[PDB]
Every structure is written in structure tokens, then in C-alpha cells.
RNA sequence: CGCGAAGAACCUUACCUGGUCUUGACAUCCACGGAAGUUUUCAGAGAUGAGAAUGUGCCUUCGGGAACCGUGAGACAGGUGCUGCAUGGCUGUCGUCAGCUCGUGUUGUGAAAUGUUGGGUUAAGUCCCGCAACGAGCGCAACCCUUAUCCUUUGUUGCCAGCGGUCCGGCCGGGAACUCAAAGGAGACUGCCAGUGAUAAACUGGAGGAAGGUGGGGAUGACGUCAAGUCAUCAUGGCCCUUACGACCAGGGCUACACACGUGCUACAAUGGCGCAUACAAAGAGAAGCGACCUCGCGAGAGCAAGCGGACCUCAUAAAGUGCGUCGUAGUCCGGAUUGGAGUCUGCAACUCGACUCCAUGAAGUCGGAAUCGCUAGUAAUCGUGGAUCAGAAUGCCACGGUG
């Protein structure tokens, strides 16, 4: 918005871990204001994760997340007809948001049984970096380097 | 744009109601339909008598009509005579036993209803409409109305296309709720159909 | 509405007070009751022979002023149009514009 | 359906049918009662029920009993 | 001694008594664990007893009417923290900074003539 | 005997004049008065379409508030029943009296 | 384009078919006859047409008059007939956008201009400073309702902290603390601190505070714009019909269906479906009404019958949620359309055409081309609850809280 430069809202930290960055992940995963059942799915699929990649439950997230975190993206921009994809160096906070959001659009796409399976296997494969959330980060780092000309 | 009714937005702030009786849901629709007919009567009778405002309350069983009017003499007739033959056709229309009162209106130039009735009268005996408006504004302002607009509408001097000339003088603040804006309205029935006449009358605030 | 259609809703009230309110309120119980008589109803056949506008079903509400069938409001006995005209003059007591 | 405390018919149909069973079958009855349950005692007769303009001949079979009279005059033309 | 607070949030209205001595949490004559069957709602009634100290230091008997789960939680949170500032006083500094003293003003916006809800307009069609 | 007076009325200033009469009238003629306790307040609501034809989103939402007051009297004298029966209030108050 | 219509089976009803009436279904005036009313009667689809009884309310310078009904001829009635491009009233719209004007002065032959522009600033023609302008008005803002903290008063039908007793139920002594109820007050004003700024208006930050810079929400719609909408709410000038374009009735129709569009609801499923237990709301309504308990029914419901004009009783078990079981990616224990059978209820009457129940049946549909809509926070999303209209007929409309 034009005038209206603004603050932002304190989310509560996550009750089990005390992890403010993981609360944002249940919000992103939540549908229809059912935060309850988002938490069920997440807390589950970190048990299934942290067990099968040598422990640390905060830090099995933050290895898988660090892998998908971007560093540049495009930002399309008209000059007078043809339209210039400009690479632009992404903010600290928006790094995580895009990462988290891509993890979940990847997880929501697969064909395992539960969601807590689907999530656990697209946090496994992030940390050993294949599967669709890093195929997203790679096909964004193409676009930034393919259009590195324009900045 | 269309304005909110200035009487109606100001009820229970600075204007009071005119029907001031309590009911429950059995008898509410009936009281309304009585109070309608007791007003629809007393307008038709007292047309010459210059009537601002017919308050109705209902204590006990009984109905109690106050009338406000410029001309107490012509309602009271002689020794009442007329008051007392209003009561016994009112007390049919209600059903209950009745009680008429009267109040004066000291300045008929400052009542909206009477100013409008006045102007509406002159338009039926074929007076030029700009005189009729402009008399009424002057008259209120020399008796110390803080302001006043009037607004006639629709086939003026028997034109073939409707217009609405209007004419303020002084201050008339209609978004101020605190303001006492005496307002009212009237239809002139002419040979060129109807002409409608609004009148606002600011009298100061609180 | 018309003068005819306002006259029709006096005709239909005139009946239903005289008849059904007493006499059909007998026969609607004789047609009901299972634990008394199941053969000499006779009453089902007699409920037809009452005039048809004795039923309160057949009464529409009109706005006790303009006679308008739609837009009715039971508390006031009035169309939505005349409620509002009367509200704003101050002829309906206690009624003001709300906000919350 | 009319609950099982009643089935329904108009008196002016009931009594006009009692006649032309008892007296003997005839030129058809002209009813406007479309709302009237076909009873057992009506079988064989032609009744001519009103569709909204023309009365329409209906030979009352055995299989019709229970159905209403109005079911055999259609109201609306269509192609 | 009984140290009292009221607290409110949405339609919930909690009333909160603070006794000295021990760990224990009552709430409409049930255990804290019985009443709230969600972990998120538990660690917001305890929140104020963390910045300010409790393991086994004050009991609390509380009752709550109205709203739902996370409403009732938030009312109790605020109810405690009023009652703490009755008892000690000079804890306000720390409680204010987490901002549990702020009565949470957010009601549901009413529904509005014309709209399907508070702000949800119906589907527009140009032509 | 307990007699109790439910006063109800559309105007909130008109009703608690009529109350404050009754609390004075009983105390002076020798009785212990309870209240005047405020009961809750039926607010009705009527939305109406506002145009004479069409324009379904043009509306006008009215209310009637009904204010309600209760005054219990625990000790009746023989005066105190007749002191209140003989009283007459404004038109917009509705009194009741149970026994 | 879920718009009039806050609810077409009959009614409604304005439309069609057929059957009827002509000073009339509705009102006033005069004349003459009868108190009003009651009660069955056979025709007829019904409107309608042909029969037994019954008082006399009331005063009578007693004629009859008044309540009310039929008959009689004309003044008339009647018209949801035409014109919203003859009108009033009411409404939409640009738009809650910050604008729109006037007086007196001045400039210009004049239309006009200035003010109202400029420099700052504001949500704002908001405020300050300037300047041939000085002032004023309608608007903005405030004054109103609601919500967010506290105080005072007042405690039943609401409340239960500290006291005793218990059928473990605020239920019964009692208590007036607390929630809550609804009256009356306090509180927030850039008021205080720092810095920025032409020492101005203001702005950025800070403190305390329940709330901070119009704290959130509503109501409030300037001059005007579109010959915008409505003569079918009502009113109304003119034109028109007057044994019919008026009026009464029964049946039909407004529900038709090769199609095209709008707005919704339900879906396509494991963030899920079914089964069993279990928790936490708000706001409403109710006497030709809401209807408990108990009994009958698989169920819709039925029978009996307290209470309640209602902080007391009833509608009325909130549902998402939670725990435990189960289904395993399948057109399926996903989905419920459609059709058959059997019922229930409202209603003179559910054929045309009501809703709800039970058994059976189990279409399309595996996230939707071009295109396109809504939303900035208790919002969107999702979950239930109530109301008006209403005999019955809500996926619509208006309102309420939950999660978020």
C-alpha cells in the first residue's frame, strides 16, 4: 500500500519446542482454521524425520530448510513491450517463507497415504537434496543467472 | 444523494416521539391503526385551524390527544363546543374514552409544518412560486430562526418539465445531530398535478 | 391493492371467525382422534360443505393501510414502506434507527 | 400422501357416482374434482375430468384405484 | 490470602483466585490437563508463570464462562496477570513487556447488510 | 406477603422516574424496599427494504429497546398496598403487580 | 438476472378456460320495507338460486328515529388500464469521493477570474504560513449507537469467594465479594518527554496507560450526474373502459423445456469417510404460541401433559474439536443426483406442485479451456446457532458466536 507503512504481528512460539520458526510452518500448512490438526501432522512427521536422519528435531528441519532457501529470484518488469525478468536479492525473512511454502506445495502433490508421510519424505529428500522443492529452487536459480544480464 | 429524514435520525436525542405509549405484541398493531385514524380524522377536520403536530399518549385504558396549533380559538370554538364534539367521535375511533387538549404555537413562522402548509396553500390559488418561497424565508429570519431552507418541486408555474428551485438563508447543518432541525413537508394539489414542499428550520443546538 | 381485493379480506375474516373458530375446530378433532371412532367420522365429508373461505389458511395479511400483500410485518400490521414512513415521523413508539 | 386417517373425495363426486352405479352406466360424468381419490366403487365408468379448459374422458380401469382423478387429465400441451 | 483477578477475551470471562503454596491448577473443578485437551491452550495459561516464577509457589482456583477453547485460555491468561499485579505489584514491568496486561480488544466484526459476511462481498459481474 | 412490580417501558429516563417515585412512596409509608434491580433489555430488530421497487441492498435497520425494572416489597403495611395502587405514572410505563 | 417477492398447492393472483352479475365486491346521498342475528333444506363445480324460526338494544312533544339487512331509480362507484418522457413521495449511482458555492471587494470591454491558487502538512478546501482579497454557507471533523479498562449505585428469576449442612445438584441456611445485568460517572486530549521542522502547522520515536495519534465497528451520503428506477405500495395531471379493460366463482397457469447466461449449494475425498464415547458458545423467538417429563414408533412423528407473556419455563444435545476403533488410494465404507416401494405432518384439499422420514437404487464428478471474482485481521477460510416472512413450504435474506 501507498502511504501505509506498517509493523507486523507477533506469532506465538510453538508449545512443544519453543520454536518461533516452526509455528510459521503449521500456519502455512493449516487449512480452514484447523491449527489443531496441522500440529498433529507436523509434530508427527518430525518424529518420522528426526528418527531416520540421525536425530535433532529442530535441526533436521533446519538442514532440510537451509537446502531449499533461495538467495535470488526474478521480478518481472515492462520497459515498452517486451518484459524483463530482473534478478533481485531476496530478503532474510522471505527466504524462509518461500522455502516453507514450496516444501508444502511439494508435499501436498505426492501420492503417499497420510500427509505426515508425504511431508516426512519431502523433508527427507530436501536434506539429501533431490525431490520437487529443490527442483523448484534450482529452476529459480536458472532464471536469475539466465537473466543476470538485466540487473 | 438521498438524505436521511432529519426528524427520524434525531429521535431520542433532541426530537421526541409523537405516539408515546407502551404496548406488548397483542395490541401493538391495533394501537398503531387507531392512532392512524385519530390523526387521519383530526387532519381532515382541523385543516383551517393550522395544526402543527398531534401528539398521542395512552395512560390506563384511555387515549389522550394533545394538539398543537397556531389557532387555539378555532379548535376550542366557543365554550369548547367543538373540543367536546371532537372527543365523542375520537372515542369511537379509539374505542376507549378520550381526552383532547390544546397547546398554542406562538410563532407560526417557525413551525415547519405550518410554513409548508402556508406555502402549499398559496400555490393552489395560483400564486407565483418564487414569492411564496421567499416570503417564508424572510419571515422566519426576522423572528430569529438561525436558518431555513425551503424546496419546492415539480411543474412550477405549470411548466411541462419538472424542476426543484430551493432557497436557503442562514445556517442549516443537517449532519449535526445535536442540531434542532424542525422539518416537514406538504403536497400542493394543482391543475398541473402535485408540487411538493420541504422546509427545514434550524433553531440552534443542544 | 384494489378496492375489490381489500373487500375480499374482510369477507374471509367475517367467515373464519363465525365458522371454523368454533364449528370446524370440533370436526378437525373428530377427523383427528384415533382412540374414538374409526368409521363414523362423517366429518371429513362435512368439512367440505363448510364455505371454503372459512379456513384461516385462505387469509393473506395486507398492510392495514395500502393493502399491499408482500412486505408485511406482524408486529405493526404494515408494509415495509409504511413502517418506514411512520417510523420517521415518530408515530411508532420507541422505534429508532439502530447501530451496533 | 394423505396420512392413513382418511383417503379423500368431494361429496359432489361421491354422490353423483353412487347414482350412475346404482341406476346404471351412462353418458360420462363432468367433474372438476381433480383432487379426489379413485375408489373401488367407480370402476367401469367414464369420468370426464377438467384439465383447465376441456373435460377429458377417463375410462376407470381396475389398476387406477388409489391414484387421483387429476393424474389422467394432463394440463400442459407440449412438443 | 485470596488474591483476585478478572480476565476477558472474545466472549470468555474468567475469574481467577491466587492462593500461596504449591503447584496446582483447578479450573471449573477439573485438572488443567482434563479441561484443555490441546497443548496450545495449556501453554498460554502457564505463560505468565514463567516470566514470573512458579514451580510450587502459588495455587490457583479459576472458573470461566463463555467463548470456546482458545478464547477461554486467553481470558485466563489475562485473569492470572491481573491477579499477580494484585499480589506482588512490581512484576508489572516484566508482564507489560510480554504484553499480557493488554486486554485483547478483538471482537468478531458484525455482519453487514449487502455482504455475505463482515467483508466478503458477493461475486461481481461486469456484464 | 411479597408483592413485586415489573416496570417496563421504551424510554430509559421515563422508567427510572417512575421507579424512584415507587421507592420513595413505599419507604415513607413504612416498608422495607428491595431493588430497583435492572433486568436485561429486549432489543428487537427489524431490517426493511427502503425503496418502493427493487434495490435489494438498500436497507434500513430499526430497533425497539424495551427497558425492564423490578422492585420487590417484603413488608407490606395496609397503607403500602393502597399507596401504590392509587399512584399514577407516565403513559409509556407499563406496571404489573404479582402477589 | 437468490432483484420487487420478509416465502405462487387453494388463497395470494394481477394471467387462461368455462360458468355468472350490471348503481355493482367497495363508499356517500334520497325513497320505501324489515330490530340485528339465529337455524337446517334440496339443486349446482361453485358463485348462486327455492325453506322453518326469532326478539324489539333504545328513547318516544309516540312520528318512528338509530344499530343493521334487502329492494328501487340515478348522482356515481370501480379499474394491478396507458404515460416514471407531465408529476409528488421514495430509492440506486458517481462516492464517505473532498469537494461545491455565495456575499462584499478587486482585475478584465466581456464571458469570466480572484477567493478556492502558492510553500508546508493532513484521512480531509485538515491546519499553519503566505498572497487583492476579506468573510460566509453546504460538505470534512465533532455532537449519536456499539465495542475495549475502571468506579458508583442496585442484587432476582442472575452470581457463589469466605462460612455451616448435603440426596454431592448453588441444592438449602446464608453471603453482596466475584461474574453478569443496566442506569449513572471517570478515561485519551498529541495531555507529558525527546528529536526533526520557517520559533508555524505538523511529523518520527518514547513513557505511563485497558486503549495512542480518527483505538475497532456502525449510523451519518454536499451541489449535482444519468429525461437512471418505480403511475403494480401509496399519491397524482392528462388519456382511456363503464351490461366491461369493472365484479363473483370453480379448474388450470405463474413450477412448462432443444437451449444460453447470472447468483448460490454439494462434491470429486485420508488436513479425510463411517462407528462409539466426550468437551467449550453467542445471539435470538414464544399464547389460534413455545411445548418439557413419561409412554408408543427403526424414523419422520404420535399419545398424555407440567411449566412459561418468560435472566425463572420451552424451542435447545452447538458443530467444527478431542480420545478410541475402522477404511487403504479404489469411481472406493469418496459422491449423493435420479428412480421404485412404504410412510409422517400441515392444510377443505399435497394429481398438476409442499416439506420431512424409512427400505431399496448409487448418475455426473478424479480439482475444471479462454477468461474472471472476493479479502489487509478476529479479516479470508471453515464450523455450526437463531430470526423475519410463514398453516406448511430457506442451499436465499438478515443476524449470532466457534476455530482461525
- Map out the domains of chain A as residue ranges: 20-143
Q: For G372, which residue's CA is nearest its C1'?
A: E125
Hits for CB < 7 Å against strand G across E residues 92-121? 92-93, 96, 99, 101-121
Alpha-carbon distance values, D29 to A43, D9, D48, D55, D63 (Å) = 81, 15, 6, 10, 20
DSSP string, A71-127: SEE---EESSSSEE---EEPPHHHHHHHHHHHHHHHHTTS--SSHHHHHHHHHHHHH
| Beta-strand pair B193-202/C78-79 | unpaired
Instruction: Report the alpha-carbon distance of residue B108 to residue D19 in Å, rounded.
Output: 82
Classify E31 as helix, strand or coil. Answer: strand
* C87 inside 8 A of chain B by CB: yes
Instruction: Report the alpha-carbon distance of residue C59 to residue C75 in Å, rounded.
Output: 17
CB crowding A29-46: b at 16 or more within 10 Å, else e: bbeeeebbebbebbbbbb
Instruction: Report the alpha-carbon distance of residue F62 to residue C96 in Å, rounded.
Output: 6
Q: Which residues span the domain enclosing C53? A: 1-90
Q: Which nucleotides of G are covered by protein (CB under 7 A)?
A: 1-8, 10-14, 16-18, 25-26, 38, 44-47, 77-80, 86-97, 123, 136-150, 154-157, 160-162, 177-184, 208-211, 215-225, 227, 229-238, 246-254, 256-257, 262-264, 270-272, 279-282, 284-288, 302-304, 309-311, 318-323, 328-329, 343-352, 354-355, 372-382, 388-391, 397-404
Q: How far is the CA of D64 from the C1' of G21 (A)?
A: 41
Degrees, nearest 5: CA angle E98-E101-E103: 120
Q: Under CATH, which number does the domain F2-99 receive?
A: 3.30.70.600
For residue C89, give the nearest of B18, B22, B28 by CB distance. Answer: B18
Closest nucleotide to F39 by C1' from CA: G181
The alpha helices in chain B, defined as continuous H runs, are 28-45, 72-76, 83-94, 112-124, 129-142
C-alpha cell at A98: 518461500
The answer to whether strand G lies under 7 Å from the CB of residue B160 is yes
Asked whether E80 and E49 are in contact (CB, 8 A), the reply is yes
Nearest to A118 by CA among A47, A67, A45: A45
Instruction: Report the alpha-carbon distance of residue B191 to residue B116 in Å, rounded.
Output: 19
From C50, which residue of chain D is nearest by alpha-carbon distance? Answer: D11
Put simply, the answer to whether C44 touches D11 (Cβ < 8 Å) is: no
Which stretch of DSSP H or E encloses residue E87? helix E69-87
Kindly calculate the radius of gyration of chain F based on its CA atoms and give it in whole angstroms. Answer: 19
Put simply, the answer to whether C34 touches D10 (Cβ < 8 Å) is: no
* Structural domains in chain C (count): 1
Distance from CA of D62 to the nearest CA of C (A): 25
Q: Which residues contact B17 (CB under 8 A, 6 or more apart)?
A: B11, C90, C91, C93, C94
* Structural domains in chain D (count): 1
Kindly calculate the radius of gyration of chain D based on its CA atoms and give it in whole angstroms. Answer: 13
Query: Experimentally, how was this structure solved?
Result: cryo-EM
Total count of residues recorded for chain E? 127
Instruction: Report the alpha-carbon distance of residue C36 to residue E116 in Å, rounded.
Output: 53
Dihedral, CA of residue D55, residue D59, residue D65 and residue D68, to nearest 10: -10
Name the resolution in angstroms.
Answer: 3.0
Q: How far is the CA of A94 from the C1' of G194 (A)?
A: 35
Instruction: Report the alpha-carbon distance of residue E83 to residue E90 in Å, rounded.
Output: 12
Q: Which residues contact C6 (CB under 8 A, 6 or more apart)?
A: C62, C67
Instruction: Report the alpha-carbon distance of residue E54 to residue B176 in Å, rounded.
Output: 56
Residue with grid cell 376441456, as numbered in its chain: D54
Q: How far is the CA of B135 from the C1' of G398 (A)?
A: 48
For domain A20-143, say whether CATH 2.170.190.11 is its number: no
- Does a structural domain hold residue C70? yes
| Beta-strand pair F93-94/F3-9 | antiparallel
Q: Which residues contact F89 (CB under 8 A, 6 or more apart)?
A: B59, F18, F21, F95
| Beta-strand pair E12-20/B147-153 | unpaired
For residue B28, give the nearest of C65, C76, C96 by CB distance. Answer: C76
Which stretch of DSSP H or E encloses residue A20? helix A20-29
Amino acid at each position: 500500500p501507498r502511504r501505509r507503512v506498517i509493523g507486523q504481528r507477533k506469532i506465538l512460539p510453538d508449545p512443544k519446542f519453543g520454536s518461533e520458526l516452526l509455528a510459521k510452518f503449521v500456519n502455512i500448512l493449516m487449512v480452514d482454521g484447523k491449527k489443531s490438526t496441522a500440529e498433529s501432522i507436523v509434530y508427527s512427521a518430525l518424529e518420522t524425520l528426526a528418527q531416520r536422519s540421525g536425530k535433532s528435531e529442530l535441526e533436521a528441519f533446519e538442514v532440510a530448510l537451509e537446502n531449499v532457501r533461495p538467495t535470488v529470484e526474478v521480478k518481472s518488469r515492462r520497459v515498452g513491450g517486451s518484459t524483463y525478468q530482473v534478478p533481485v536479492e531476496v530478503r532474510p525473512v522471505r527466504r524462509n517463507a518461500l522455502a516453507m511454502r514450496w516444501i508444502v506445495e511439494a508435499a501436498r502433490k505426492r501420492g503417499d497415504k497420510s500427509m505426515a508421510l508425504r511431508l516426512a519424505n519431502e523433508l527427507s529428500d530436501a536434506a539429501e537434496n533431490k525431490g520437487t522443492a529443490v527442483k523448484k529452487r534450482e529452476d529459480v536459480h536458472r532464471m536469475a543467472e539466465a537473466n543476470k544480464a538485466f540487473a | 444523494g438521498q438524505k436521511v429524514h432529519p426528524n427520524g435520525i434525531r429521535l431520542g436525542i433532541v426530537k421526541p416521539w409523537n405516539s408515546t405509549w407502551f404496548a406488548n405484541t397483542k395490541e401493538f398493531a391495533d394501537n398503531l391503526d387507531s392512532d392512524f385514524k385519530v390523526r387521519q380524522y383530526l387532519t381532515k377536520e382541523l385543516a383551517k385551524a393550522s395544526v402543527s403536530r398531534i401528539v398521542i399518549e395512552r395512560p390506563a385504558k384511555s387515549i389522550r390527544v394533545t394538539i398543537h396549533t397556531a389557532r387555539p380559538g378555532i379548535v376550542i370554538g366557543k365554550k369548547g363546543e367543538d373540543v367536546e364534539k371532537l372527543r365523542k367521535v375520537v372515542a369511537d375511533i379509539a374505542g376507549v374514552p378520550a381526552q383532547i387538549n390544546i397547546a398554542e404555537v406562538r410563532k407560526p413562522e417557525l413551525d415547519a409544518k405550518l410554513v409548508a402548509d402556508s406555502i402549499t396553500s398559496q400555490l393552489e390559488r395560483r400564486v407565483m412560486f418564487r414569492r411564496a418561497m421567499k416570503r417564508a424565508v424572510q419571515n422566519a429570519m426576522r423572528l430569529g430562526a438561525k436558518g431555513i431552507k425551503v424546496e419546492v418541486s415539480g411543474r412550477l408555474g405549470g411548466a411541462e418539465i419538472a424542476r426543484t428551485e430551493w432557497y436557503r438563508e442562514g445556517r442549516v447543518p443537517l449532519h449535526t445531530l445535536r442540531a434542532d432541525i424542525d422539518y416537514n413537508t406538504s403536497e400542493a394539489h394543482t391543475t398541473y398535478g402535485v408540487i411538493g414542499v420541504k422546509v427545514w428550520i434550524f433553531k440552534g443546538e443542544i | 391493492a384494489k378496492q375489490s381485493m381489500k373487500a375480499r379480506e374482510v369477507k374471509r375474516v367475517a367467515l373464519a371467525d363465525k365458522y371454523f373458530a368454533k364449528r370446524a375446530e370440533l370436526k378437525a378433532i373428530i377427523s383427528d382422534v384415533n382412540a374414538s371412532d374409526e368409521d363414523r367420522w362423517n366429518a371429513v365429508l362435512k368439512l367440505q360443505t363448510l364455505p371454503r373461505d372459512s379456513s384461516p389458511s385462505r387469509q393473506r395479511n395486507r398492510c392495514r393501510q395500502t393493502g399491499r400483500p408482500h412486505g408485511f410485518l406482524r408486529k405493526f400490521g404494515l408494509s415495509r414502506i409504511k413502517v418506514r414512513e411512520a417510523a420517521m415521523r415518530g408515530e411508532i413508539p420507541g422505534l429508532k434507527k439502530a447501530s451496533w | 400422501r394423505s396420512l392413513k386417517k382418511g383417503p379423500f373425495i368431494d361429496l359432489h363426486l361421491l354422490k353423483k357416482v353412487e347414482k350412475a352405479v346404482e341406476s346404471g352406466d351412462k353418458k360420462p360424468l363432468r367433474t372438476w374434482s381433480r383432487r379426489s381419490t379413485i375408489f373401488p366403487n367407480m370402476i367401469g365408468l367414464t369420468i370426464a375430468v377438467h384439465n383447465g379448459r376441456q373435460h377429458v374422458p377417463v375410462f376407470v380401469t381396475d389398476e387406477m384405484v388409489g391414484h387421483k382423478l387429476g393424474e389422467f387429465a394432463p394440463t400442459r400441451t407440449y412438443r | 490470602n485470596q488474591y483476585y483477578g478478572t480476565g476477558r477475551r472474545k466472549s470468555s470471562a474468567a475469574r481467577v483466585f491466587i492462593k500461596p503454596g504449591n503447584g496446582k491448577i483447578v479450573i471449573n473443578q477439573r485438572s488443567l490437563e482434563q479441561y484443555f485437551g490441546r497443548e496450545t491452550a495449556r501453554m498460554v495459561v502457564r505463560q505468565p508463570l514463567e516470566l514470573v516464577d512458579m514451580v510450587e509457589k502459588l495455587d490457583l482456583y479459576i472458573t470461566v464462562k463463555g467463548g470456546g477453547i482458545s478464547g477461554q485460555a486467553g481470558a485466563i491468561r489475562h485473569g492470572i496477570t491481573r491477579a499477580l499485579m494484585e499480589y506482588d505489584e512490581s512484576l508489572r514491568s516484566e508482564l507489560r513487556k510480554a504484553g499480557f496486561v493488554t486486554r485483547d480488544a478483538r471482537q468478531v466484526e458484525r455482519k453487514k447488510v449487502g455482504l455475505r459476511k463482515a467483508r466478503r462481498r458477493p461475486q461481481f459481474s461486469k456484464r | 406477603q411479597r408483592i413485586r412490580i415489573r416496570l417496563k417501558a421504551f424510554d430509559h429516563r421515563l422508567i427510572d422516574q417512575a421507579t424512584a417515585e415507587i421507592v420513595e412512596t413505599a419507604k415513607r409509608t413504612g416498608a422495607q424496599v428491595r431493588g430497583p434491580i435492572p433486568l436485561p433489555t429486549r432489543k428487537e430488530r427489524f431490517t426493511v427494504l427502503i425503496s418502493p421497487h427493487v434495490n435489494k441492498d438498500a436497507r434500513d435497520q430499526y430497533e425497539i429497546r424495551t427497558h425492564l425494572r423490578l422492585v420487590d416489597i417484603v413488608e407490606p403495611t395496609e397503607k403500602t398496598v393502597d399507596a401504590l395502587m392509587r399512584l399514577d405514572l407516565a403513559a409509556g410505563v407499563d406496571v404489573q403487580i404479582s402477589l
